[PDB]
Ligand binder design. Structure first.
Ligand SMILES: O[C@@H]1CNC[C@H]1N1CCc2ccccc2C1
Length: 328
């Protein structure tokens, strides 16, 4: 089997991407944030504290004839945002691919950042099932449950810049990229799609060969890299500065940003400069927020949407997982 669904930016800045998901019988369609950095499928629900719902579409398990409460099971996750609740099993379909018995984690509580984002109805985790938070019996991701049925045990992320994109399950659309796909090793030891980039370049500058361990994380907006790398990037933008009050590098909105290249083996993925502009820091300001930021406070480097949307990305869930990147 295969599935294919369109993913859409939630706003004009590509702050996140939503993908429609059918849950239950009859179907209840929710728009979920597909997150390759986490492993829970959780949703706003009829159980969510009413004051914490502000425009989201909710899952109502009592209206699904296939929903079954998973007795004694709870979940709780933190990303500074958080959410928690109880657990149903139900039928879940993405893009025509159906899993029966998927754990659907129904929120009783969500933090303010989720409440304040009316466009995101929950998350669909695509990291490794070792990170799933359900207790006392951990549950499998949608991809893990689907994998044996898929034509090939893979999914692909093709995120658009200011444009729609696609998540495919079970096949690699050879028309969606240029050149070849370069595959690179993955460590699953921390439960992530963790890999090592071979280096970087800023604009038209020389490529610096250096190992950068990080995660391919569709649920993170920005590109978080070591302080040395990030300083080298912003040094090429006249007037850019790290702002303690804003919480990262900012730059004059009138600037033209250079591209940023990252290495995948001997291959190179070029992020156009415009992908790195996250707009005014507050409405009407002429200072803009940068899309490449230091990972120093995080403890891991994160190839978030800024990086991934410059590529066609293969999440290969074969017995030894790998990641593939192609230009597009
Ligand atoms: O918010 C992200 C969306 N995808 C998963 C979430 N992860 C990313 C990795 C990470 C590393 C250190 C501490 C927290 C986190 C949160």
């Amino acid at each position: 089997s295969t599935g294919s669904a369109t993913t859409t930016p939630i706003d004009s800045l590509d702050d996140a991407y939503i993908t429609p998901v059918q849950i239950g019988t009859p179907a209840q369609t929710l728009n979920l944030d597909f997150d390759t950095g986490s492993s829970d499928l959780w949703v706003f629900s009829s159980e969510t504290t009413a004051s914490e719902v502000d425009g989201q579409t909710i899952y109502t398990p009592s209206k699904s004839t296939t929903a079954k409460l998973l007795s004694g099971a709870t979940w709780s996750i933190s990303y500074g945002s958080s959410s928690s609740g109880d657990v149903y099993t139900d039928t879940v379909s993405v893009g025509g691919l159906t899993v029966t018995g998927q754990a659907v984690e129904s929120a009783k509580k969500v933090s303010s950042s989720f409440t304040e984002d009316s466009t995101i109805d929950g998350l669909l985790g695509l990291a490794f099932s070792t990170l799933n938070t359900v207790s006392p019996t951990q549950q499998k991701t949608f991809f893990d449950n689907a994998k044996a049925s898929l034509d090939s045990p893979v999914f692909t992320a093709d995120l658009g810049y200011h444009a729609p994109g696609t998540y495919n399950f079970g096949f690699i659309d050879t028309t969606a990229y240029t050149g070849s796909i370069t595959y690179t090793a993955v460590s699953t030891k921390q439960g992530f799609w963790e890999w090592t980039s071979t280096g970087y370049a800023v604009g038209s500058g020389t490529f610096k060969s250096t190992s950068i361990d990080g995660i391919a994380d569709t649920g993170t907006t920005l590109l978080y890299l070591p302080a040395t790398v990030v300083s080298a990037y912003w040094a090429q933008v006249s007037g850019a500065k790290s702002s303690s009050s804003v919480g990262g590098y900012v730059f004059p909105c009138s600037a033209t940003l250079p591209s940023f290249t990252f290495g995948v083996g001997s291959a190179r993925i070029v992020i156009p400069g415009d992908y790195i502009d996250f707009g005014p820091i507050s409405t009407g300001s002429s200072s803009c927020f940068g899309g490449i930021q230091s990972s120093a406070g995080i403890g891991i480097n994160i190839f978030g949407d800024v990086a991934l949307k410059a590529a066609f990305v293969v999440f290969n869930g074969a017995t030894t997982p790998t990641l593939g990147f192609a230009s597009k």
